[model samples]
Target: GSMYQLEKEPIVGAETFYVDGAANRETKLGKAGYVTNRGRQKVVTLTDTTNQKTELQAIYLALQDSGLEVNIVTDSQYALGIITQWIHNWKKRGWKTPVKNVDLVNQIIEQLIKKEKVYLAWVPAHKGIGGNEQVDKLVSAGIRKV
Candidate 1:
């Protein structure tokens, strides 16, 4: 119930978004990008971010803009684990954390609380899954754009 179970089927009728994020450590610019099953693509620019925060940014953008139940797939294991597992521990301490990205973490969870149905999956990167591959390339475009 907390993660992608190998035995579970894909969510029928759900809007699936392949999301990815990046930080150009050299430039200190961060980017979030996603490609939807319907062929929609979006990216946003962020500042003062790490590669990890940008991953949350991708999910936050998807959550902010969607009205339909959504399935979000990504390559960031850290992002996936932060949202699902570490969130519980953060809650116990009133969301105060040593991590700098906790602000974005809280924002993602706040949106999460309102979502009716959302599924998250961690897929291995660069394995030729079109959306994953596309979004991976897509993230760099924004970093380059800025």
Candidate 2:
């Protein structure tokens, strides 16, 4: 039931992105993207909600779409912690959570239960990190196109 035991190879510098919502309700959107060392990058846009669910959804997309072992770079400690540390305990407890985002969490668990490996790291927002900056721009660009 645990995919963590599978052999995993690290793709160094593989970074994922997370973005919040726009202020305008009509244009508000959440975006996620990841770039791998193999010149693969994917971006997705979802309904605008800046909660844990949206954040986790971004992670899920990155993991599922890429099919590569990646390091997720995120501003949300909540998202970072859930995937890297808390998920194991949650799985042992049968995926129970007192907080919201159960569905999103389960979806993430489903992805994690597969063979691919994902790693997470925290980066402060708006710090001019290249990947972070690009994701921010991507989110805005997605909103503009919608």
Candidate 3:
């Protein structure tokens, strides 16, 4: 039998970008969208509803398991607005700013920045980048583990 030396060591190449999806109660999904890792690349998508933190965390954890770093990439001016623009200030204020979803935002931010190889990136949605579009569809469609 032959095995690759870095089989257990995943080399993450790029960060993924997409819009947020519509949030749903059943999924506990969030509106600010999500940043996740899928094997070799990271992803983000929009959510049309609110408070989907649990589902978001599930996506994040799954991505992490794939050995890739995750970060939020969204176009929602509301969610992305505060997260990308005001996150630093919130962190400076000890995360007690009156920002919507401040608690989970703080947690996700802390985890992402603290992780060894994680970071955020921004992109315009629906521009037809294959990875971004694919990720967006996957998220919207929602997959299950067999």
Candidate 4:
């Protein structure tokens, strides 16, 4: 599917949100967090984890599962670029890319294909964005998890 196809779909007015991920070196764990204007938030921490970048991809997949039209704000420029731009070429190449996180990227692309709508926006990290800051806090909680 292409952006044209996505644009043609029914526009759903779901609240926008921010997402972030973190890695716990002590436990070798990865976590992802999501925060919305409606005070809806969630965080997932996994033991059999990859790295922080893959965690962001996992968060995107989780967002898709929510079935909401979300404007996903993130500090990871790579994540935003891949989902909104690189995905087209990646799909054309049979999901093959020179990127290191091929598996995670492919998974995110698959989720994007299934989602109703998702808009990626990049924000400078720790710049005092409320949603971004909240997500960072959630990521910290995940790191502290036992």
Candidate 5:
């Protein structure tokens, strides 16, 4: 018997990537003293588990260890939206949320974005055309340690 509820949005299939060479050529000049767009090729997949922040932090750490600065992008609407947009309100409200995950993630986000350069981009999930997929797979495969 199935013990758990069916997912609201089920995992349909594997993700995919698109290398936009022209876009890269225009945006990704590896000039000295600038954050090269080369590292942006790594795509990171996000999960809604309890350890999401830890996982994101791990990815940041891994990228740093590899001499890359992380530009974390995710499908988290709350992360990219509410937290980024309404931080003052959240903090003034003592960081309480109608739900638990939001506050926890917000704390992680605030901490993670404090140093160097960090940015957030929103994407519609399951579209499967993200560079973050490479980050997801490599992170999943434990390739960071290699």
Candidate 6:
């Protein structure tokens, strides 16, 4: 981040959480899973929830106050677009149009606003990244519970 230097910050290791969500199409059960920087992991299950809701919830898990700056990592371009780009247009439309998962997006905004610094990082899925792949399986395994 200086003159003549163009390198991305390597923030993917520590203070970063990888998040993913999964839902059984037939059962309608959803799970939110996250893995922390030091391998701390958790999965939350929900009954009759959409994949979108669970994905947003995964971010919420990362947003919990940890007394340190945090970064949220996800492979979901859908969820990423929601938080990054689409929300602005949605708001401009009086929070209408498409009109899906508005409450969950608001929930993310609520937690994010509480933090002094928060980073939402997106990575492409199925790239053989260790944490991301583990998180993907973790959330999927949760679907079997319900």
Span of ten consecutive residues with least summed lDDT in model 1: 1-10
Residue 58 error for model 5, in Å? Answer: 6.3
The per-model lDDT (C-alpha) reads: 0.78, 0.57, 0.43, 0.65, 0.36, 0.72
Q: What lDDT does model 1 reach? A: 0.78
Q: Which segments of model 1 are wrong by more than 4 Å?
A: 1-9, 87-98, 127-129, 142-146
lDDT of 1 by residue, 1-146 (tens): 33223213457788788999989788789889799998788988888888988998999988887754788998999888777765445435455454767688878888877766778889888757589888888787757542
Candidate 4 per-residue lDDT over residues 16-123, each given as its tens digit: 667888776766787777887777788777675555564565456456646646566778776766655555563364654546666776667667666656666677
TM-score of 6: 0.77
Superior by lDDT: candidate 3 or candidate 4? 4
Model 2: lowest-lDDT 10 consecutive positions: 15-24
TM for every model, in the order presented, reads: 0.81, 0.66, 0.48, 0.72, 0.38, 0.77
Report the Cα RMSD per candidate.
4.1, 4.7, 10.6, 4.3, 15.6, 5.8
Candidate 5: Cα lDDT at 32: 9
The true-versus-predicted C-alpha distance at residue 29 of model 4, in Å, is 2.1
What's the distance in Å from true for residue 109, model 6? 0.3
Residues 3-47, candidate 3: write the lDDT tens digits. 101122233464443334445566544322334444343334344
Candidate rank order under TM-score = 1, 6, 4, 2, 3, 5
Better of 3 and 5 by TM-score: 3
Candidate maximizing TM-score: 1
Candidate 6 per-residue lDDT, tens place, 65-104, comes to 3434577778887787777654345325344434888777
Indicate whether candidate 2 or candidate 4 has the larger TM-score. 4
Q: Residues 1-146, candidate 5, lDDT per residue (tens digit)?
A: 11112122312331222111101123222110111234433433333332334343443333343321234445445444444544334336454453645555445544544434344455544434245444444443422221
Query: Which ranges in model 6 have alpha carbons more than 4 Å from their true place?
Result: 1-14, 86-98, 127-129, 142-146
